Design a protein around this ligand. Structure first.
Ligand SMILES: *[C@@H]1O[C@H](CO)[C@@H](O[C@@H]2O[C@H](CO)[C@@H](O)[C@H](O)[C@H]2NC(C)=O)[C@H](O)[C@H]1NC(C)=O
Ligand SMILES: *[C@@H]1O[C@H](CO)[C@@H](O[C@@H]2O[C@H](CO)[C@@H](O)[C@H](O)[C@H]2NC(C)=O)[C@H](O)[C@H]1NC(C)=O
Lengths: 49, 49
């Protein structure tokens, strides 16, 4: 995830958060790592022919 | 990796070597496999407005 979510933009569904992946920022934790996933989510659909 | 690095071109970051993946060639090793990763690396940048 560090390489594919933070050092690039992924197309893998659900791999880098929910929505269309834009970017990620790492944060450190005591024995691990926390990823902040930024995604694009569409809203307010309308009907068309 | 045999499927995704050798039988195709991957966009996965750092999965098929360092740089932009072009192609890979397998070699047999005793009890293992060796991947020769061919990558594209840019060089000699200039700055512009
Ligand atoms: C697009 O049109 C359809 C109907 O063709 C709308 O469907 C409605 O759906 C609600 C539930 O969400 C039902 O209670 C209504 O009875 C439906 N209407 C009809 C006329 O069947 C749908 O809501 C429309 N989509 C948008 C985004 O407005
Ligand atoms: C593009 O311009 C930037 C400055 O805007 C260059 O960075 C400077 O590089 C010199 C030489 O290494 C350093 O002494 C300066 O401290 C740098 N400035 C800053 C603000 O970091 C950069 O090297 C230029 N790129 C190229 C290819 O020439």
């Amino acid at each position: 995830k560090m390489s594919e979510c933070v050092l690039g933009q992924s197309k893998r569904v659900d791999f880098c958060g929910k929505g269309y992946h834009l970017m990620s920022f790492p944060q450190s934790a005591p024995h691990g790592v926390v990823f902040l996933h930024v995604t694009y989510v569409p809203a307010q659909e309308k009907n068309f022919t």
